[PDB]
PDB file of C-alpha atoms and ligand atoms in Angstrom:
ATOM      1  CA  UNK A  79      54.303 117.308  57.639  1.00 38.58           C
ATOM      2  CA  UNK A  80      55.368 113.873  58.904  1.00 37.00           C
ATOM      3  CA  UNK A  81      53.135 111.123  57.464  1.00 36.43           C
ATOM      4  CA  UNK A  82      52.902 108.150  60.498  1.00 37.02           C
ATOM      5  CA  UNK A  83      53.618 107.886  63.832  1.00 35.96           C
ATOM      6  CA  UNK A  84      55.573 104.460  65.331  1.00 29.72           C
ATOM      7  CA  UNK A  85      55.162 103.798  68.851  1.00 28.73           C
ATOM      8  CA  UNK A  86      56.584 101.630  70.609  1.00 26.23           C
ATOM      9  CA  UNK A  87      54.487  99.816  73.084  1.00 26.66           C
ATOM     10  CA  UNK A  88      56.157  99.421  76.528  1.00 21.58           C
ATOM     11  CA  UNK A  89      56.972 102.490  77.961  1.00 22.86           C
ATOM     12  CA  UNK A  90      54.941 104.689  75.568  1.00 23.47           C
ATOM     13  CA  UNK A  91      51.594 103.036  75.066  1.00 24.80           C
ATOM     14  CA  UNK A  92      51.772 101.294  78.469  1.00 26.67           C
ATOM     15  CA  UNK A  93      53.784  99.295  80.979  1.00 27.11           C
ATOM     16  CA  UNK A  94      53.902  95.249  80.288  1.00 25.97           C
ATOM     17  CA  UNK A  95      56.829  95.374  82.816  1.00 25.77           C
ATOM     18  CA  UNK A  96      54.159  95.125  85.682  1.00 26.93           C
ATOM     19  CA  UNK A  97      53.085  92.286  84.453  1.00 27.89           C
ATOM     20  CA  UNK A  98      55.855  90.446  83.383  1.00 23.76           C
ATOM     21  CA  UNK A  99      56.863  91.235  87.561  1.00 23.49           C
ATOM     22  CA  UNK A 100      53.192  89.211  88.326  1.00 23.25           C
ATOM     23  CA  UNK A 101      54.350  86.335  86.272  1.00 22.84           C
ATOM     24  CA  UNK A 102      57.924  86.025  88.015  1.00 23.27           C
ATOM     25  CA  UNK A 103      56.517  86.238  90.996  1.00 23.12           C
ATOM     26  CA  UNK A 104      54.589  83.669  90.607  1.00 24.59           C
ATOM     27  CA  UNK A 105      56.696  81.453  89.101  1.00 24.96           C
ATOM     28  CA  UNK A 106      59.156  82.258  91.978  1.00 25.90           C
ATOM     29  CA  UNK A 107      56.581  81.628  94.818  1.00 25.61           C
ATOM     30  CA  UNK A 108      56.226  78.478  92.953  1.00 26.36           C
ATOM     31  CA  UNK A 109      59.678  77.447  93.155  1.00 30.95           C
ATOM     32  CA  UNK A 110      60.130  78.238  96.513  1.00 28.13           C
ATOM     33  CA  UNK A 111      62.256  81.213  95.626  1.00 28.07           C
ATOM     34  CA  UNK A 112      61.908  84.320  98.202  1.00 30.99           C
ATOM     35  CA  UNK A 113      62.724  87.945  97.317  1.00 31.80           C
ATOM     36  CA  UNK A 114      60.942  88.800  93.739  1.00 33.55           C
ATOM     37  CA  UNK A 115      59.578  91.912  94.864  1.00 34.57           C
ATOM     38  CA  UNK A 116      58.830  94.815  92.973  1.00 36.65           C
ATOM     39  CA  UNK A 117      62.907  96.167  94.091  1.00 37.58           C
ATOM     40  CA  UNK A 118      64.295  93.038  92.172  1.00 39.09           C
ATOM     41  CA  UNK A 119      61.601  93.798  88.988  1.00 37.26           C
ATOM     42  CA  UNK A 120      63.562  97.314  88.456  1.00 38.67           C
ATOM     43  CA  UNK A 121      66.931  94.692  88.025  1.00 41.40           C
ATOM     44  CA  UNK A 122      64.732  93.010  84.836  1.00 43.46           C
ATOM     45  CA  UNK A 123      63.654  96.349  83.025  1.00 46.67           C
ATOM     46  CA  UNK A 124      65.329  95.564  79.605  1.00 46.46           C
ATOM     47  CA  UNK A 125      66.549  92.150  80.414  1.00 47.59           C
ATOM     48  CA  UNK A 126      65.500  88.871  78.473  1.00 46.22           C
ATOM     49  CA  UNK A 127      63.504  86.129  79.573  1.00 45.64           C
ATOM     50  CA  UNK A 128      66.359  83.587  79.795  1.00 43.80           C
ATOM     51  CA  UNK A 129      68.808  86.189  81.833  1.00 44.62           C
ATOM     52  CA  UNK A 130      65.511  87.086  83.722  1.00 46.45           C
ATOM     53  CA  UNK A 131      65.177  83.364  84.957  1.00 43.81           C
ATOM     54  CA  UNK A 132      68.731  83.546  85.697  1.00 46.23           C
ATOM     55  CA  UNK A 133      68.762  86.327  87.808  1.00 48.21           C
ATOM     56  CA  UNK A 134      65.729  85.046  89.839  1.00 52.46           C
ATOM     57  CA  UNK A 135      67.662  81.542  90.163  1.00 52.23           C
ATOM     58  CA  UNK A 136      70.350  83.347  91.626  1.00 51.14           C
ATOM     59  CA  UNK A 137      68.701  84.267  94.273  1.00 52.82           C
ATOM     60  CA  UNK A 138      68.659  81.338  95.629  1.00 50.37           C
ATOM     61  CA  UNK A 139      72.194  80.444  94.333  1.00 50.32           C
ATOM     62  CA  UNK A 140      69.847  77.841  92.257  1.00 49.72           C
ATOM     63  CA  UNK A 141      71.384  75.736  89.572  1.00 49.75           C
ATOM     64  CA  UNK A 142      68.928  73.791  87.473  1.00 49.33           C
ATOM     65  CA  UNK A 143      69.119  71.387  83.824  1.00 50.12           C
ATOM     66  CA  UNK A 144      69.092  73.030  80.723  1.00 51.07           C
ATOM     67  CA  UNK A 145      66.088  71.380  79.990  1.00 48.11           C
ATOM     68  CA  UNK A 146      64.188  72.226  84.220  1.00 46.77           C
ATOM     69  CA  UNK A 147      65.572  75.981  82.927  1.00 47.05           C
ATOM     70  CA  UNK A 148      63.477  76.034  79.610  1.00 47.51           C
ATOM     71  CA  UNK A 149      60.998  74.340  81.560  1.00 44.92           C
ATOM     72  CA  UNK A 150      60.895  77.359  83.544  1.00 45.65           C
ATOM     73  CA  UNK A 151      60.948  79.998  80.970  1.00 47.15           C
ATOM     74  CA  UNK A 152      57.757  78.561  79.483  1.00 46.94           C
ATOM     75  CA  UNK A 153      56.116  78.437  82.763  1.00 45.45           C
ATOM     76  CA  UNK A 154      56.864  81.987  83.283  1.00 46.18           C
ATOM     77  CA  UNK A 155      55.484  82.658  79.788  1.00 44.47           C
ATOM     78  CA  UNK A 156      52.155  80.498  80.755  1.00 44.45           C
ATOM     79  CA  UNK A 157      52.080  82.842  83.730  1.00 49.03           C
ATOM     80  CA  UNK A 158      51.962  86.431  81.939  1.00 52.21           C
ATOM     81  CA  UNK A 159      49.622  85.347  79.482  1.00 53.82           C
ATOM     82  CA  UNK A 160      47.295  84.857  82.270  1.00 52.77           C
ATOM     83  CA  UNK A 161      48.265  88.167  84.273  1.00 54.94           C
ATOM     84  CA  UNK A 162      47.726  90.014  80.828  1.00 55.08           C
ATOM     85  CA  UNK A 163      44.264  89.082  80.947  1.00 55.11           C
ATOM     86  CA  UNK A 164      43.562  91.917  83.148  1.00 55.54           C
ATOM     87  CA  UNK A 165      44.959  94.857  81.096  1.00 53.32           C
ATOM     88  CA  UNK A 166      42.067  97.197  80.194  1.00 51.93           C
ATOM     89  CA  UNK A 167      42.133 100.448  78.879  1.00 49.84           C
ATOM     90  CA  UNK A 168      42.919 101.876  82.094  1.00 53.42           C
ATOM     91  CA  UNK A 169      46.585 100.574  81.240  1.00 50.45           C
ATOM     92  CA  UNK A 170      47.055 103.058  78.545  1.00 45.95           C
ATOM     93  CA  UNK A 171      49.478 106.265  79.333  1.00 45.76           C
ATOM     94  CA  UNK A 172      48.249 109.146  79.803  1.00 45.21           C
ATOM     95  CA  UNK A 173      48.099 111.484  76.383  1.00 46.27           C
ATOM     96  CA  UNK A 174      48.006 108.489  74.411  1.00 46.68           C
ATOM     97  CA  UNK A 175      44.550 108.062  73.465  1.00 45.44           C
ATOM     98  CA  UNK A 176      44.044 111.743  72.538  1.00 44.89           C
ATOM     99  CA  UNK A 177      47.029 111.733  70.733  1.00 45.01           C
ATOM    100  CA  UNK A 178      46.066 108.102  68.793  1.00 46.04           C
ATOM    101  CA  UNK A 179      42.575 110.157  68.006  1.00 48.23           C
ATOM    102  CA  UNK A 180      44.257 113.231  66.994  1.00 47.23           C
ATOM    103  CA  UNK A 181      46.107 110.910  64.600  1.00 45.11           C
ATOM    104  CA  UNK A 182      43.586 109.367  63.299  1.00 46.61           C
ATOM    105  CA  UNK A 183      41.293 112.394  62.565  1.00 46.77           C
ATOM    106  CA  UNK A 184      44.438 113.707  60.509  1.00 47.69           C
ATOM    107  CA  UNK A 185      45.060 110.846  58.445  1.00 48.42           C
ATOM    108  CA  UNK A 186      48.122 110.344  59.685  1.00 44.00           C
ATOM    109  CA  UNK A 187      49.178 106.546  59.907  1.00 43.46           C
ATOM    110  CA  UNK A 188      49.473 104.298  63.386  1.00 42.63           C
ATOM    111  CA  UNK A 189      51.960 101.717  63.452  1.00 39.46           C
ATOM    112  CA  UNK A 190      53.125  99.604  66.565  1.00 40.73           C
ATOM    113  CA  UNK A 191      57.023  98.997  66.443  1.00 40.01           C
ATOM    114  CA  UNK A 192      57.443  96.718  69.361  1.00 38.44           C
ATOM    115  CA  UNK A 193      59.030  93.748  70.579  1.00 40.16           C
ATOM    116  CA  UNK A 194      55.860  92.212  72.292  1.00 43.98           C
ATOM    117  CA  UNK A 195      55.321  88.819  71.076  1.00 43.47           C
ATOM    118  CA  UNK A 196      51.858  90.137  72.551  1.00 41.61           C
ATOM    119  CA  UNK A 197      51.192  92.854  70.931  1.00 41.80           C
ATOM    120  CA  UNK A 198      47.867  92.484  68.872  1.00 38.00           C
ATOM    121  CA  UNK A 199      46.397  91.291  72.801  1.00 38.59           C
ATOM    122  CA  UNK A 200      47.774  94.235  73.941  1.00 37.75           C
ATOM    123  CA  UNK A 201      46.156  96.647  71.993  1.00 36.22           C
ATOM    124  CA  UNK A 202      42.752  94.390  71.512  1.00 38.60           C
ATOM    125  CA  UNK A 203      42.800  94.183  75.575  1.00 37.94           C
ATOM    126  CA  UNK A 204      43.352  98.533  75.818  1.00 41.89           C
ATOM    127  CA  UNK A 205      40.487  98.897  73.224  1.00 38.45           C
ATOM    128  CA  UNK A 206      43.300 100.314  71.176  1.00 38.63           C
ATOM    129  CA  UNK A 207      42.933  98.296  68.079  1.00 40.88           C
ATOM    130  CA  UNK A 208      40.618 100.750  65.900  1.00 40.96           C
ATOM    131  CA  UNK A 209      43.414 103.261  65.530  1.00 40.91           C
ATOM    132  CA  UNK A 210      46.082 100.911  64.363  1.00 38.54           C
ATOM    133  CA  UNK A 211      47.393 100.905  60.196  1.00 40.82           C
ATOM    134  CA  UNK A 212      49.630  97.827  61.286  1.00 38.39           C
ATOM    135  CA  UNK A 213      51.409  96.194  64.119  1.00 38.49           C
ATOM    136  CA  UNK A 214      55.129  95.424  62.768  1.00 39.61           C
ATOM    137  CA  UNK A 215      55.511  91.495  63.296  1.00 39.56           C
ATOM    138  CA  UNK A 216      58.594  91.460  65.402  1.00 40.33           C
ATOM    139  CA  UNK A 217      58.769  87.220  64.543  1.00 38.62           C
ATOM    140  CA  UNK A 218      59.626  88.875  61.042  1.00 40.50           C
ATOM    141  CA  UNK A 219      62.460  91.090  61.761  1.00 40.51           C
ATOM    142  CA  UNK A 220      66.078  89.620  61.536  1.00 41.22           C
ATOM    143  CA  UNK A 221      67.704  91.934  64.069  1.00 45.35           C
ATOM    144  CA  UNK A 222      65.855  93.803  67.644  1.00 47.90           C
ATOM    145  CA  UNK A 223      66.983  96.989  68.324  1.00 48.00           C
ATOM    146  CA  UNK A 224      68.723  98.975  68.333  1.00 44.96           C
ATOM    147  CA  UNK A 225      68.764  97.599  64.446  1.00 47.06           C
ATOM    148  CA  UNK A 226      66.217 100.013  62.879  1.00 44.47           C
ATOM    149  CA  UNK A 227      64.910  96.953  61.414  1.00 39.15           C
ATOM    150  CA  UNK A 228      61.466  97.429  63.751  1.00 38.16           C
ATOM    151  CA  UNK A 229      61.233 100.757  62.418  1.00 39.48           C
ATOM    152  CA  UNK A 230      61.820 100.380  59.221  1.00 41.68           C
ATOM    153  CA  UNK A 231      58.946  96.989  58.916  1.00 39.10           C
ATOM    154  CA  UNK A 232      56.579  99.453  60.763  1.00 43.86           C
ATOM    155  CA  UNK A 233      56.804 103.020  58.257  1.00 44.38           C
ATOM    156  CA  UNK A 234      57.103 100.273  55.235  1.00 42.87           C
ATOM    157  CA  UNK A 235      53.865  98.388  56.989  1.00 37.39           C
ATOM    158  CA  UNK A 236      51.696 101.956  56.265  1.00 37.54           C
ATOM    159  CA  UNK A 237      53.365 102.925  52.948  1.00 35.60           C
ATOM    160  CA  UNK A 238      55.564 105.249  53.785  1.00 34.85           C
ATOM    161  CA  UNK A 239      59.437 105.571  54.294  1.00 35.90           C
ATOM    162  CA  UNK A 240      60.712 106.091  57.705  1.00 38.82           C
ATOM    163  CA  UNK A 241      61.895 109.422  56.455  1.00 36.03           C
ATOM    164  CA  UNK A 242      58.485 110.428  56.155  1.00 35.41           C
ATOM    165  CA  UNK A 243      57.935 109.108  60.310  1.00 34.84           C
ATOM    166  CA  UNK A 244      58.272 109.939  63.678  1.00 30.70           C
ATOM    167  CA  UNK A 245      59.157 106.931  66.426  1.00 32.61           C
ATOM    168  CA  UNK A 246      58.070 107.472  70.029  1.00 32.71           C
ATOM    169  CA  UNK A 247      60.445 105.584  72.574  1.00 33.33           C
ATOM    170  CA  UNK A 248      61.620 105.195  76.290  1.00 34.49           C
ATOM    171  CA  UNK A 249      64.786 103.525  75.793  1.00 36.16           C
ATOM    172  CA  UNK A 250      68.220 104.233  74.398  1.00 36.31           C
ATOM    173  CA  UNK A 251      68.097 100.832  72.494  1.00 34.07           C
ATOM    174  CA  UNK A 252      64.840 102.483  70.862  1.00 33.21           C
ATOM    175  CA  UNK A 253      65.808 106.190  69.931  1.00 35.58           C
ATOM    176  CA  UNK A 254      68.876 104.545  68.423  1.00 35.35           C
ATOM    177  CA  UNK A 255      66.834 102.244  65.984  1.00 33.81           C
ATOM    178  CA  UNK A 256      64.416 105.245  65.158  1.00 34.38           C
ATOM    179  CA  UNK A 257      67.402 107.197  64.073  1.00 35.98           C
ATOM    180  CA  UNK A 258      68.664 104.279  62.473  1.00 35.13           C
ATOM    181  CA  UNK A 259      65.472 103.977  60.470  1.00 34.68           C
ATOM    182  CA  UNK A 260      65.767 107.803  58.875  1.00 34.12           C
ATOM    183  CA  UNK A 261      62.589 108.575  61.587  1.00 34.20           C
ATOM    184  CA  UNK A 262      62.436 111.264  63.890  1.00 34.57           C
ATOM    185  CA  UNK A 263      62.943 110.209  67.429  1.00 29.96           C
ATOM    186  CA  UNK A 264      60.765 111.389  70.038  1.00 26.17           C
ATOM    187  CA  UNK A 265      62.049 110.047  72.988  1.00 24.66           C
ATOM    188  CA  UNK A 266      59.750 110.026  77.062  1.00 25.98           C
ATOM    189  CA  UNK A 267      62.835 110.108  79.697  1.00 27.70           C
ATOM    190  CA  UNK A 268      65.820 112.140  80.709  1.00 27.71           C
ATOM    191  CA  UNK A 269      68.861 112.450  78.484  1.00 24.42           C
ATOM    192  CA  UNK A 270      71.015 110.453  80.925  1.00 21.93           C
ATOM    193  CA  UNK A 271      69.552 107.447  79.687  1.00 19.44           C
ATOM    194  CA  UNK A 272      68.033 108.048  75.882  1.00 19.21           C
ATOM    195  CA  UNK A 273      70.931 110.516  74.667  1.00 20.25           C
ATOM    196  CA  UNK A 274      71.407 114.549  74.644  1.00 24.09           C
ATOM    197  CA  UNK A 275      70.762 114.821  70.345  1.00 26.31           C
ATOM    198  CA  UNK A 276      67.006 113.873  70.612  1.00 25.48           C
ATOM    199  CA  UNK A 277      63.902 115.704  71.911  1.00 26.44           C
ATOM    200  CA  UNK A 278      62.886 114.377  74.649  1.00 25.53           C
ATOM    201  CA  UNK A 279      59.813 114.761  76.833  1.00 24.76           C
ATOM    202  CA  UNK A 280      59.237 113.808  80.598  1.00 24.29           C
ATOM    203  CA  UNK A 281      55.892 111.516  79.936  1.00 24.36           C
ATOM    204  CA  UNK A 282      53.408 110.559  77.591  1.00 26.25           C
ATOM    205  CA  UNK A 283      51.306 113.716  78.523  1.00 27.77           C
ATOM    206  CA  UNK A 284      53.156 115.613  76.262  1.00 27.29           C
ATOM    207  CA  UNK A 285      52.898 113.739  73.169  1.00 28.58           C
ATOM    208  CA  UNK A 286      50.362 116.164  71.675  1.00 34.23           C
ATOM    209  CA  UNK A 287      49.985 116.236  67.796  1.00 33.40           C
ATOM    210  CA  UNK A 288      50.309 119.910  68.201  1.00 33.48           C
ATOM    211  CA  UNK A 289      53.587 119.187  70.316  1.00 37.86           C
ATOM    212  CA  UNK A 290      54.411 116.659  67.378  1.00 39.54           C
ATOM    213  CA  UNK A 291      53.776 119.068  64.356  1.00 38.33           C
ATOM    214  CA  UNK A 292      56.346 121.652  66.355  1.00 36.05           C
ATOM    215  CA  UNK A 293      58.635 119.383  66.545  1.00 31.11           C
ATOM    216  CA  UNK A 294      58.941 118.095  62.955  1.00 32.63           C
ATOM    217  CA  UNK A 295      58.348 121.848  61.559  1.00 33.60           C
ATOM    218  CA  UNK A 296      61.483 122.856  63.521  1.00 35.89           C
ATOM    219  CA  UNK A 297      64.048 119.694  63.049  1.00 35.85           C
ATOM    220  CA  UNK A 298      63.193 120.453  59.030  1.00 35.58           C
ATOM    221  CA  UNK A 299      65.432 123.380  59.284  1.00 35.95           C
TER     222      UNK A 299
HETATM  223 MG1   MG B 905      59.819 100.983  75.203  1.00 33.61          MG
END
């Protein structure tokens, strides 16, 4: 049976995109830029802070300084760490917790494998902390997927090889690092956008540990 589970965090655990839209919006209102609505936030799912500020800039046909642009960026920053704030465990997906639990109970490891400069808050703010083995430090990985690199930091992080893992992930960039890693994607989506050689579920409901142990049990033959 698989030995750890590695989650990613947005998209799986919960949704930091809604508050990353807060902060732009605020920033924009700010600025005196119109038209950040929650339309324009689907146009910055996957999209990096700096192209982010771009694309909000634009619409306004703004050009600023190099230096007014980072001076931007770190304002927007300043602004989600206050919108974060209000995350509570009412953020977390639904199946999560029972699954986390389930986990747990089985001695089967928890690892975080995300991105989020945030993360530790994250989980701390969700009440999610308790079930945790490790959070991978993203500042310590040379390469963001889809380099397995995450992946591979996370299964090492709880003692155990990737091989030994399955990785939980809503985005194409993620079920290709998992595979990368020698884990077992589990990917929450539609094949159109994660890839038709994974299993894939339609939402966090469905990550059971019984749905879990099937799953591993019939990709070992
Ligand atoms: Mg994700």
């Amino acid at each position: 049976m698989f030995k750890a589970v590695l989650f990613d965090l947005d998209g799986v655990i919960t949704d930091t995109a809604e508050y990353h839209f807060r902060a732009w919006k605020a920033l924009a209102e700010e600025i005196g830029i119109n038209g950040v609505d929650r339309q324009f936030n689907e146009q910055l799912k996957g999209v990096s802070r700096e192209d982010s500020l771009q694309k909000i800039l634009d619409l306004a046909d703004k050009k600023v300084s190099a230096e007014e642009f980072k001076e931007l960026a770190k304002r927007k920053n300043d602004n989600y760490v206050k919108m974060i704030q209000d995350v509570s465990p009412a953020d977390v997906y639904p199946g999560i917790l029972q699954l986390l639990k389930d986990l747990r109970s089985n001695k089967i490891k928890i690892a975080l494998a995300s991105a989020s400069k945030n993360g530790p808050f994250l989980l701390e703010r969700m009440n999610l902390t308790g079930y945790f083995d490790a959070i991978a430090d993203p500042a310590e990985v040379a390469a963001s997927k889809p380099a397995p690199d995450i992946f591979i930091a996370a299964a090492h992080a709880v003692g155990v090889a990737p091989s030994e893992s399955i990785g939980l992930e809503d985005s194409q960039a993620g079920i290709q690092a998992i595979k990368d890693s020698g884990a077992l994607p589990i990917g929450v989506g539609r094949p159109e956008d994660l890839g038709d050689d994974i299993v894939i579920v339609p939402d966090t409901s469905h990550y059971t540990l019984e749905f879990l142990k099937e799953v591993w049990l019939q990709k070992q033959k």
